[PDB]
Design a protein around this nucleic acid. Sequence first.
RNA 1: GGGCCGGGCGCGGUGGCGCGCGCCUGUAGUCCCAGCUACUCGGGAGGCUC
Lengths: 75, 76, 74, 71
Amino acid sequence: VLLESEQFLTELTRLFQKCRTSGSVYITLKKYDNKCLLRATDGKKKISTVVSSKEVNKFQMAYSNLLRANMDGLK
Amino acid sequence: VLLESEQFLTELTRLFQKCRTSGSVYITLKKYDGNKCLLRATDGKKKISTVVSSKEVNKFQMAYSNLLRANMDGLK
Amino acid sequence: PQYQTWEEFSRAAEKLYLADPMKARVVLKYRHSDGNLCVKVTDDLVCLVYKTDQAQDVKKIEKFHSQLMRLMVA
Amino acid sequence: QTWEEFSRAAEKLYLADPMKARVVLKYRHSDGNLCVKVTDDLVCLVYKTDQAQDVKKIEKFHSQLMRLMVA
RNA sequence: GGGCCGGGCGCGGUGGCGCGCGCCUGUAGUCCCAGCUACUCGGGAGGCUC
């Protein structure tokens, strides 16, 4: 079941937040069939969405910010 | 850009002043026709040139010579 | 195979995706508690893998994604 | 010598064909160094300096070459 | 209506384009502005030439 582009990004932000303490986030990207499917899960809970040319712009920047700010633990 | 005798000198002074911290000030001289010579100056960003004729060479060279000598004091 | 520099793995990965923009898939796994990232690109027969714990990389990746996301949508 | 010789070669090119050659002059205040070059795109004759006593002659060689172009 | 008003190497920027910094180097023959919003595709003003 697909989620609206925006909603997707909120659930995702949430996954990361829940997995900080101790867990893992998985995000996968594949051509949908022009669109591309995007899925993410923490092991149990699973979220997905489809991003098109109609929406790549608003989405990339948002998605970009999400990944950058939430992957902090590294050296 | 092609300037008039004067103009060129003031723009040129700047090129040196706008490069005292870094960058290179180029100047190429050349015999020109299509008697006159083509004078060009560039800092890499802004370009400027002028056309010097036998009619003004003395008056122009007077200031141009002081200009080059004063702005180029920075070597060993 | 796994790679030691983002440079290689990048084209390696991009090229691989290119030779079949339909089977290929890219997954990412971040574990905050261990402080490491891990990108892998598969074909379910071929598998490329990059592992890191250098923050200097998160951007290189968020980019890669943003890059792959462009092909998939043109 | 080097400078005295150099000028000769240059004034040789200017005369050989004063319509195909040109003369560049690169001043790099920071690194602190001057550089004169006279070419004909078939003969790269170039002279670099960093010492201060060398500006005067380089500038004169410039002013002159100009005069032969306007004479 | 179409072509052109500079080229080269390195670093930086952006999904990408325009773009920023450093160095090198041309012609008789370039200026201004930040923009475009999935796009090998931002906008204005001059000049040259079919």
